[PDB]
Design a protein around this nucleic acid. Structure first.
Ligand code: MG
Ligand code: MG
Ligand code: MG
Ligand code: MG
Ligand code: MG
Ligand code: MG
Ligand code: MG
Ligand code: MG
Ligand code: MG
Ligand code: MG
Ligand code: MG
Ligand code: MG
Ligand code: MG
Ligand code: MG
Ligand code: MG
Ligand code: MG
Ligand code: MG
Ligand code: MG
Ligand code: MG
Ligand code: MG
Ligand code: MG
Ligand code: MG
Ligand code: MG
Ligand code: MG
Ligand code: MG
Ligand code: MG
Ligand code: MG
Ligand code: MG
Ligand code: MG
Ligand code: MG
Ligand code: MG
Ligand code: MG
Ligand code: MG
Ligand code: MG
Ligand code: MG
Ligand code: MG
Ligand code: MG
Ligand code: MG
Ligand code: MG
Ligand code: MG
Ligand code: MG
Ligand code: MG
Ligand code: MG
Ligand code: MG
Ligand code: MG
Ligand code: MG
Ligand code: MG
Ligand code: MG
Ligand code: MG
Ligand code: MG
Lengths: 96, 64, 75, 50
RNA sequence: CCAUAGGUUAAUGAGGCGAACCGGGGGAACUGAAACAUCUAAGUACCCCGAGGAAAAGAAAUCAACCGAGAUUCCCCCAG
RNA sequence: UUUUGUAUAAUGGGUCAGCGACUUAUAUUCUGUAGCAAGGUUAACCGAAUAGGGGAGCCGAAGGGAAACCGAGUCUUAACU
RNA sequence: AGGACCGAACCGACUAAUGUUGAAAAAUUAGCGGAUGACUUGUGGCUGGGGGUGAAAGGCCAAUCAAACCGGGAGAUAGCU
RNA sequence: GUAACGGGGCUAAACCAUGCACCGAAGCUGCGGCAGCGACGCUUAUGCGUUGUUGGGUAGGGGAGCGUUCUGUAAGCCUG
RNA sequence: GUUUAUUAAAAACACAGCACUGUGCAAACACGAAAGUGGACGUAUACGGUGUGACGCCUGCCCGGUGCCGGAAGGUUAAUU
RNA sequence: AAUUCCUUGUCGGGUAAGUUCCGACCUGCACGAAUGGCGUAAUGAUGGCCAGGCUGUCUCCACCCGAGACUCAGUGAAAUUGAACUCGCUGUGAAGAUGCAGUGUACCCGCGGCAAGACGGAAAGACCCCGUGAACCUUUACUAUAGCUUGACACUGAACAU
RNA sequence: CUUUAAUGUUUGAUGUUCUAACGUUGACCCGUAAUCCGGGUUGCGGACAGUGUCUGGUGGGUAGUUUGACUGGGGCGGUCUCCUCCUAAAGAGUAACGGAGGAGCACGAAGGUUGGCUAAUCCUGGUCGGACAUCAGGAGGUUAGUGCAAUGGCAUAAGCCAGCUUGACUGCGAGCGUGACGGCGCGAGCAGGUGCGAAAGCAGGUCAUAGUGAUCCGGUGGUUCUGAAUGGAAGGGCCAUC
């Protein structure tokens, strides 16, 4: 960072933002995964048991990340607008 | 020895999808009354670290 | 008692007669209207002349005071 | 300098304000001007000139 | 005055040494901050006191999160 | 050796032989390369000891936004051509 | 009688020559000043380092003093050669 | 110390002009040789016979290598 | 008399003398976290500091600044409440 | 003037000749009354100037006695030193040449002398700048702080008037 | 309940008195053949001194440091940022302690728009008309004027005047120009909403280029974005801004 006696960019420029305390317990799940849950039920903790998200996550989504295969019942997870069509376009079930 | 971050660097830059860094404009803090509204409008939105300046901030953020 | 000067403002012509420009591209930075905006060319608050249309720059002298006018014909 | 910064407050509850300057000696009264309140989306009257 | 000091004698022990960890009592500046006084170097070097096969900590007025994990010294993550 | 420049009357070596100056540690990043590959590797720790076990965890497939969140979008703005 | 007088031993150091890889890390040779006094000396003892002691020159503190000597932080820092 | 043609000497061996020769360089050319890259002639883990070119060099950057000392293949292989 | 031992012996430091000023003694000061020693087994005709330097003739003018002595009514004024 | 810049001031005094000295004047660049003023007999290895003495200090050096130099024997060092087949002059060039150029001069090696040169030896210039260097000193620099001082609660309480 | 006295208590102040902590480097006794020391008695003092905690003052006594750079050595003197011209060799840039000047402000209209308007100075004539206040005539043609330095602009005026007013609007942004950088600047057009006009239209500040201050720490005000168990809260965030 030394740029000569001149004020470096990281002092030149201002701070912004705060950390909210949520990134570390919220994970995202892709379609290339979910079939590996070795039990055919997608819950809040099944995915934890399978070592796919992480032990301290409390919220999860699904997003549209391609390839959707075996029918799954996504329970206690949010599903994006797109993802619901892919999950159902291969059966599966969504419930709150 | 794990590396130590220049911690002030980490409070002004966040890394984007391809590998550059986004940042906030200077001058937005005080002494705003004399500045034209247009000038402040184009300074509100975030910017990219320029090519000439990338060669050091990256030195400062090995864990970004 | 001296010892002062001003920074150069990098004025002068940026696009000359016979050059393809987009819209918005600056053609001349000036102090007064040494050059004037002609057909299809616009004038900013510091008399910076800019293109209002895609095309080629054209310097002509028109009217009774022999002023220089810059226009842009689409190509 | 010798010209003070003031704040104009929107006469519609919004918390939008403009900032400008004033010769407080030569111009002692409260400045009053229509400006666009981006919250009520209309040209409302603005007050204050400290 | 009683009394306590004070005195006398036996037996018993303690006295000092030598690396290092430990525990605690004391505690710098150079340096770095391309000046330097906050901060850094460091609770580091040094002082002393003491000590075991180790010491010191140790058994929830500790955490958790409305589900529960349960003394406590240590190895890698968490995580620069 | 140093300089703009040195027979330079600028510096260093009297001669010899031996000694005598870009290393060690961990990170992180580029390259050459190996294995493996939408997955790649485990750390301690166990030990029949470099074998084998151990995926806690870390890198990646998805990032936009301070964050809420939304998600092949998203942030802007009341909405954007 | 006197920090009187001339003046050896004693003490000290104004002049000059030598000596400068000296005989000697200040001395010798020719003169010098003081020599019963605030004298001179033996033997011991006491002051310890931003401290001492000084009839004051920053003088003396073991041939070292604008901060003595040994070992330690220590390969301090060296943007300099 | 000649000491204001580098010297001796020069009335041209000075100067102007027109010519025509001749010396003169690590340049050009000639002959032999090496490397880099470039292509063909052709096939091939090519190499060339070729063949266009190119090869002064601080700092500095790239690339290919020689040898020392120690371990293994090495109870192998040398060696009175 | 004294001095920079080891280039400065002097017009320098000291001296008796003179002045100012602190000091009632468990003094003031000075050494030392403190005990306790000096001062002094002295007691203001005595002790400390500071300036001046025998003897002679003498030491004027300024209190605004500056530094000290005294002042205590009013201004500002900390902890605490 | 131990102060005086101008200044060798001016004037007298001494001398043949006196930027010093002595005397004076006052124009005090820029004396002064205990950071003492003026003057003082005595004392002083103190500073300045002069005079009778004395002279090798000198004019201007002559001659002599000894110690080393010098010759033999015995013993035996030193700093320095890229390498030496280590010359004059002129010019040249990192601008002052034993090494270049031109040119002149010179048989090859000692021992005794001098010291003009080797930008001689010795010392990583003591002047001088520069380093965001260092170390002791200063004060109405900064900032803290010992000592001194102000108080407040505590050690630390009991009565009475107001 | 409105108001006050008494007393008891409580504690606040001012003085006087006491004695028991608290001092005694007053005398005597004892441990005892002891100038220490302790205990004991007694006199003297006494809620004071002295000491610890904190607090205002003092403090080169002693400590740590700072004490700019440039510069035709340094110091002295001057400079340090911006703007205009110039050297600058006819695009941009260009140097020195080269040559001349300026800025650290002003404006609620000295801003937008609609309509509409034209200077400087010679000659002649004219009340008080004086060389030059003012009316008139022609000559004259931006030398005037531009809120101020220079330069380039200016008549369609950017100059001068007015009625109406607020576009000095908030959101944005094709494309560029200039920057090592941070940044700096030009802008047709778009949504919203606006002013003026009959309208086409013109307005996102002042003819333009000076009118300056990054980062931090903190301050307002709106914003449900965050809220360390939860609900709020605090602090953090963003916008506005000092
Ligand atoms: Mg995981
Ligand atoms: Mg803000
Ligand atoms: Mg430092
Ligand atoms: Mg320091
Ligand atoms: Mg234990
Ligand atoms: Mg429970
Ligand atoms: Mg040089
Ligand atoms: Mg070079
Ligand atoms: Mg030589
Ligand atoms: Mg040199
Ligand atoms: Mg040399
Ligand atoms: Mg040498
Ligand atoms: Mg005598
Ligand atoms: Mg005598
Ligand atoms: Mg002497
Ligand atoms: Mg001496
Ligand atoms: Mg003798
Ligand atoms: Mg003698
Ligand atoms: Mg002795
Ligand atoms: Mg020292
Ligand atoms: Mg250290
Ligand atoms: Mg070293
Ligand atoms: Mg001639
Ligand atoms: Mg040839
Ligand atoms: Mg060939
Ligand atoms: Mg080469
Ligand atoms: Mg000595
Ligand atoms: Mg002498
Ligand atoms: Mg006295
Ligand atoms: Mg005196
Ligand atoms: Mg007072
Ligand atoms: Mg005379
Ligand atoms: Mg004479
Ligand atoms: Mg007086
Ligand atoms: Mg005086
Ligand atoms: Mg006197
Ligand atoms: Mg004497
Ligand atoms: Mg011999
Ligand atoms: Mg040469
Ligand atoms: Mg020569
Ligand atoms: Mg000699
Ligand atoms: Mg030399
Ligand atoms: Mg020399
Ligand atoms: Mg040197
Ligand atoms: Mg100091
Ligand atoms: Mg300088
Ligand atoms: Mg130009
Ligand atoms: Mg007239
Ligand atoms: Mg809470
Ligand atoms: Mg807030």
């Amino acid at each position: 960072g030394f740029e000569g006696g001149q004020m470096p960019l990281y002092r030149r420029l201002p701070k912004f933002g705060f950390t909210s305390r949520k990134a570390a317990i919220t994970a995202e799940i892709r379609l290339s995964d979910l079939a590996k849950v070795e039990g055919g039920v997608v819950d809040l903790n099944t995915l934890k048991a399978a070592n796919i998200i992480g032990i301290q996550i409390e919220f999860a989504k699904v997003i549209l990340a391609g390839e959707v295969t075996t029918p799954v019942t996504v329970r206690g997870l949010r599903v994006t607008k797109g993802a619901r069509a892919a999950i159902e376009a291969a059966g599966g079930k969504i419930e709150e | 020895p794990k590396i130590k971050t220049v911690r002030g660097a980490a409070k002004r830059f966040k890394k984007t999808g391809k590998g550059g860094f986004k940042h906030k404009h200077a001058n937005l803090r005080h002494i705003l009354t004399k500045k034209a509204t247009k000038r402040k409008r184009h300074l509100r939105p975030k910017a990219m670290v320029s090519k000439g300046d990338l060669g050091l901030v990256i030195a400062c953020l090995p864990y970004a | 008692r001296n010892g002062r000067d001003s920074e150069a403002k990098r004025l002068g012509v940026k696009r000359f007669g016979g050059e393809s420009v987009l819209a918005g591209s600056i053609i001349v930075r000036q102090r007064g209207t040494k050059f004037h905006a002609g057909a299809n060319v616009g004038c900013g608050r510091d008399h910076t002349l800019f293109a209002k249309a895609d095309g080629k720059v054209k310097f002509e002298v028109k009217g009774p005071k022999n002023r220089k006018f810059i226009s842009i014909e689409a190509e | 300098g010798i010209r003070e910064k003031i704040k104009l407050v929107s006469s519609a509850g919004t918390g939008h304000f403009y900032t400008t300057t004033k010769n407080k000696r030569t111009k002692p009264e409260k400045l009053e001007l229509k400006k666009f309140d981006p919250v009520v989306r209309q040209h409302v009257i603005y007050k204050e000139a400290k």
